[PDB]
Subunit: 399 residues, 4 copies
């Protein structure tokens, strides 16, 4: 039972949660806890030595981790999205080989893939074709996800060459240890402090022909067609949404423990028990109700993702558009609820809860930081276009 | 397929929706459409001639109707809650007889039951015990639900007698046509104008021994014990929440049709197409998202209600308290979303939409009216008490 | 003291407020009450027989009236904007003559002026030049303000002629009684039911040379230049904002009276006094605070309007742009607070308040209807463009 | 011009704002900048060598400082409240002497006064009367305001003696340097990191008879009576509110600078200029409008404070209750706007703004921390009680 294991880890990590958030840097010990749990192979099919969990289950595990630790929930969650990329645009052979390696070695996968807000011809990583059919990568991917301690790195380069392949996005899974590859200890933010999201430098990094995933530009092709690879954004976006919800629960659970044990009643109002204050009770109702709505919608969306996933290549553009719209909604609901709860929970906690030893602002800092990955306003607009005009989002990395 | 039948009725009723809201009075024709549909016996088990539908399905049907017509959705929905009251506190024999009569005759059931905000000793309807073991009812039930056109009336009387039964609530299912029973044409409100929610007068109305449902005070007993009869409030409240969600969908669908065909763009802002205005698109996004969360939570709650229902007498006080807490949340989400959408939809409709021929305010008036049945603030407080203190609601008619 | 007179009228009108809202049609009696009060000449300078009140005072009067009656508040408020149009783009001679007539005769002024969302070449009222230097008007102004019972009609025609004046907006003040002028009894809406906002037909209506206000296209010229005439939108928009605030106070005052005298406490929660319910108290807190901020902003904007007004022709485009931005803010604050309060007030009133005899939904209906005159989204955008980019709104009828 | 001097200081401090927030500890340099400005004597009457500024001006100065630095705005603002305490309950002689010392020496005043949520008999600082007519203080004041670097310390002790003075609150102004007085370097919080809000220990600290302000329990007497000393809470609370508004402007100004120079447009939506994004523009509109209303309310309340203040001892319990109600509103408006804007600003800033070198979360951390000083829910409930029941807040330290 993967969820139970996550629960186990969450208990272990909670004793160091405040300190780790304060220290920042890499959460090396905890990453190792995860590796030892066997959880890294959660979505790898059983036949290759994985758990073969479904998306709903996998998302529950993400949520557990995110509640204990935003950074870890993001690290793990993003790790999960990587390997599916193989099933999505990679060959059958690449699929057997890579899934087997990840599962057998308990590999951390890492990401130096999309530049979500740059034209391909401006991407900072070039892929220059070699005559043996591979590529060499050069430049700095400024925003990465868990490249730093990874074993297998998923990288995108752009042929910026005046090749006939010019502007093609090249996807590859290469060892992080390969010469030329330098994941920097580069990451600094007010929140998500231990997500290892700094830059990686690529210096004449060779990509072997069999390390290349699908044809040149295979991702962009899959998007335009709404073929199976277009499931990328829906998957990443739903994981993110559920990280936020996990963080919201964590903040709410922390708050209530505190309210029960440490919070003092406002005596000038004649209140004798903090847990009996009518406004404190109302606030807890409102937090819970916001989560109840957002969680239920996230679960629907997870079953929908499963259904679409199980259709394999027979999925329609409508299937994927409907799923993306659903997920856009969840992303919005989760952003708004996690921000509101993470900040709001202070009101029922009181002045003493502002002490650094509680680290109570960490839940907000975590959500506030990652929720800026891609603008929630366009998630909302995409839902509105669909409701009003029947339009589907333009498939990309974030939609 | 009961939902497809409701859809068919909804199509019929939409042509008259504006006129009927404006006229008020009883929706006699439509009530007859419902009777002829067979839908009245929707929750009567198949073995008695009913559809034997589950709760989730019955709630979808309520939703379809509520989207076309809030009053009808409430009338039908409240009708559904009545017969289960037989299975809840009635005998097995009463069960077979009454279910069979309802299903065979396509009976409308009606309600002159609880006074939700009065002490039992102040209730306006007395039940005076007769020596044959029945009772006589006297007084006026000021707030009823669909007594007016009903065939079978569910009534509560209080022994206000200085009997040894004093203060006991007596529950009975009697024919509405019985002598002494006068459902008045009494109902006036700004919304829910066709719900027939006026008073009914009782004058030396005889209740036969086999028309009495369970022991004296059987309802109050079931509440204190959290036995099966305590399922009443969760069921009624979930139905209400779903009526609101239906209305919210009705308002939203009406708005979008209008925005697509009638609305004009704000030219001073350089907008050429109303469906391309970025704030109009955002607003539609928000309405959709608010509904997405609340609908998902209502669905969960419906499955939970099914699970608890299926436990029969084996249900724990915890089963029932958890259920009621879930339902309280739904009731809050639904109220808030229906109100916001119902009023907010005008912004994307424009000035011309205010013309009485569209009846666009009817959705808001409907929700605004029924949402006051019991205070949403205590639904919210009940959720907060559970989250913060682990307390369950005190079982009653509305909690 | 014009405010004390408004208070006096408000007392008189409150006895009939419910019935008049229900009846619709013209508020003939009440319009006469206003005429007899002498209040119609409120903004006419003392030297012409007027009260010569300043803008802050005049707005307080509008607010008093709007609290008693949304339709009348709008009727009166819009009347006030009309005559200033004379000082704005009319001659000194037209000024002395017309002001004197309005004040001596206690004239109602009415409006068949701007089509806010139509290109000038599509405006339904043509002004065809006559050789004596006047014009003839033809066509139907579909949306008017208080043309129906007016004495003096402010009308715009468009030379749609292939004149050399083609596309020029011609402003005239003519007697409503002139032959050809037919203000129809045409107005139907869910709210603002007695504002007489129907159409007026023009049939070869003669406008004499000295009835023409300013040169041809004088209004459009004043906007482009941000000259004194561009003060029109800021004035009208601030009047509207204050109508809404008036309505919001009317709802809130009505609610509180009801809560104090009629509302019953929620006994299941152990509440004994409705005025002692903590959530009821909180809600009144929030309504008050929302109004407190909106009102304070309204007053500031009114003093700013005075300051700019007093500058006469020396006003800068900056003066007028800053003013419009301030007013745009008030418009938004007022719309949002009036809608929220008008609907929210039902929560603290309870189910019985839904009875048509209280007409409690009239406040919301009135705000909900007029607030759609011009889109609040662009009032918000105009404030944002100013804050972010230093841009001023493009002068027009509504900005 | 005191505001211009504050502006000058604000410029100096902005270069170090990020680093200081990150470092925490005492803002020693900046405290000295303030001392050297002469601003500490801002509210000391001219006749004693002070600036004799009015409250509206003094509040503007607090606002300027708070925009640059939340901690400093709070430190300075709280300092301002202290000396008035002399004019409030102190003697005329104490007034001349103390005002003159503060102005001539440019003293920082500090506070170890009220325990806002403790019964007097549970207060941690005892005042034991001496036969020379003074007192000795013992115990730890756990929550102080700027006691650490102060020259003049305002202290409250409670006779916990079984004296005849038992339970009396003793107010004194003593030198912080006096033996027995130990302001600790004790303060740790997620925000307001440089307010020096730790504990001070008192150890057989002598208070001389002429260092005691007013009679024993003079503060509590002034509250019950609503005499001049009851102005304490309105003053403190209005200062707090304006500190929040200052911080809200600082966040908003910082955000707009960033949006204009650093922010990148969301290209997948076809946006080419960040400052032309319609949702970014709308967000700026909403932030501005929220402040526009709260600022306008704050200024009104400042003039009302001036008016009441100028009534000297002739102020009525109504005067003071109306004031406190107004101020409660502002406190609520300011809290809500500063929290919403401080967090919301990230959405228009984008992912890169999360870098610690911008310290963008400092505005939120500052508001989030101080806004918990006393519960905003009871500020809201006190407004609601006044609106609904005509009740005035019970005068105390926070109401």
């Amino acid at each position: 039972d993967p969820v139970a294991v996550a629960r186990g880890l969450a208990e272990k990590w909670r004793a160091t949660a405040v300190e780790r958030d304060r220290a920042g840097g890499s959460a090396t010990a905890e990453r190792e806890d995860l590796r030892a749990s066997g959880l890294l192979s959660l979505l790898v099919p059983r036949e290759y030595g994985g758990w073969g969990a479904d998306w709903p289950t996998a998302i529950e595990v993400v949520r557990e981790i995110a509640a204990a630790d935003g950074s870890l929930g993001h690290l793990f969650g993003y790790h999960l999205t990587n390997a599916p990329m193989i099933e999505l645009i990679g060959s059958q052979e690449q699929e057997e080989h890579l899934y087997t390696q990840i599962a057998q070695n308990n590999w951390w996968t890492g990401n130096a893939s999309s530049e979500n807000n740059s034209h391909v011809l401006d991407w900072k990583v070039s892929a220059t074709p070699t005559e043996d059919g591979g590529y060499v990568l050069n430049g700095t991917k400024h925003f990465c996800s868990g490249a730093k301690g990874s074993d297998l790195l998923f990288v995108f380069g752009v042929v910026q060459d005046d090749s006939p392949q010019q502007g093609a996005i090249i996807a590859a899974a290469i060892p992080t240890s390969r010469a030329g590859v330098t994941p920097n200890d580069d990451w600094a933010a007010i929140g998500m402090r231990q997500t290892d999201s700094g830059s990686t430098d690529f210096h004449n990094v060779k990509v072997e022909p069999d390390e290349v995933l699908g044809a040149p530009n295979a991702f962009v092709l899959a998007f335009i067609q709404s073929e199976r690879g277009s499931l990328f954004a829906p998957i990443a976006q739903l994981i993110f949404a559920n990280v936020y919800l996990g963080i919201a629960h964590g903040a709410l659970d922390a708050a209530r423990e505190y309210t029960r044990t440490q919070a003092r009643p406002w005596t000038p109002a004649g209140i004798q028990q903090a847990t009996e204050d009518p406004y404190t009770i109302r606030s807890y109702g409102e937090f819970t109700i916001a989560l109840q709505g957002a969680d239920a919608a996230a679960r629907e969306a997870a079953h929908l993702l499963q259904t679409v996933w199980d259709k394999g290549d027979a999925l329609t553009p409508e299937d994927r558009g409907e799923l993306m719209v659903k997920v856009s909604g969840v992303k919005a609901l989760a952003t708004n609820a996690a921000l509101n709860i993470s900040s709001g929970v202070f009101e029922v906690i009181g002045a003493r809860g502002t002490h650094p030893r509680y680290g109570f602002d960490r839940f907000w800092r975590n959500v506030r930081t990652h929720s800026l990955h891609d603008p929630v306003s366009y998630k909302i607009a995409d839902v509105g276009k669909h409701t009003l005009n029947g339009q589907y989002p333009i498939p990309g990395f974030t939609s």
